[PDB]
């Protein structure tokens, strides 16, 4: 682990506004962005694209031949951002849990030099508490300036 784990507190309505700002301020080579349902993966990818950014998405409601080709394109550096649900790429230096995961196991799969930013809503609080204790480690409120040494290669 060379991952630095932050959270931002948001409501659902602030999520896109929040991400767009992370898209501007972080120095991203590639990002992976996790949501909690295939519907939301699609909506967000569209949102990201309308805001002016490059964007692939994968989820479970796709043919495997199709999911695997997109994932391979992404691995090969043929897009900047990938929105996905749950399943490293060296160029990925930032991971965003647009939707906070529900189990420590699932978090570990998403987080396993990089940054992992969590979007925490009032409704994510028992999961945050439970996931922290279960892994030992704390997820610190997102600072005003993050040290490029922590996630930029």
């Amino acid at each position: 682990k060379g991952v630095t784990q932050y959270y931002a507190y948001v409501t659902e309505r602030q999520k896109v506004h929040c991400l767009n700002t992370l898209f501007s301020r972080l120095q991203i080579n590639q990002s992976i962005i996790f949501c909690n349902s295939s519907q939301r993966v699609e909506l967000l990818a569209k949102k990201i694209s309308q805001l002016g950014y490059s964007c692939f998405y994968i989820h479970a409601k796709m043919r495997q031949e199709h999911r695997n080709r997109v994932f391979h394109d992404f691995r090969n550096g043929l897009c900047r951002n990938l929105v996905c649900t749950d399943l490293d790429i060296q160029a990925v230096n930032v991971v965003i849990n647009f939707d906070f995961p529900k189990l420590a196991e699932t978090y570990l799969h998403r987080i396993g030099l990089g940054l992992a930013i969590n979007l925490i809503t009032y409704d994510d609080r028992f999961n945050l508490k439970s996931i922290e204790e279960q892994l030992g480690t704390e997820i610190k409120p997102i600072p005003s300036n993050i040290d490029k040494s922590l996630y930029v290669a």
């Binding site: 507190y9 506004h17 700002t21 609080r125 409120p141």
Partner: peptide
Amino acid sequence: IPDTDFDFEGNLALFDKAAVFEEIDT
């Protein structure tokens, strides 16, 4: 969709993480 920065700091304090974790533990 504001062409302006999201206020992380302001929204961080809407939520007292220590207070909340203390309460749930009781």
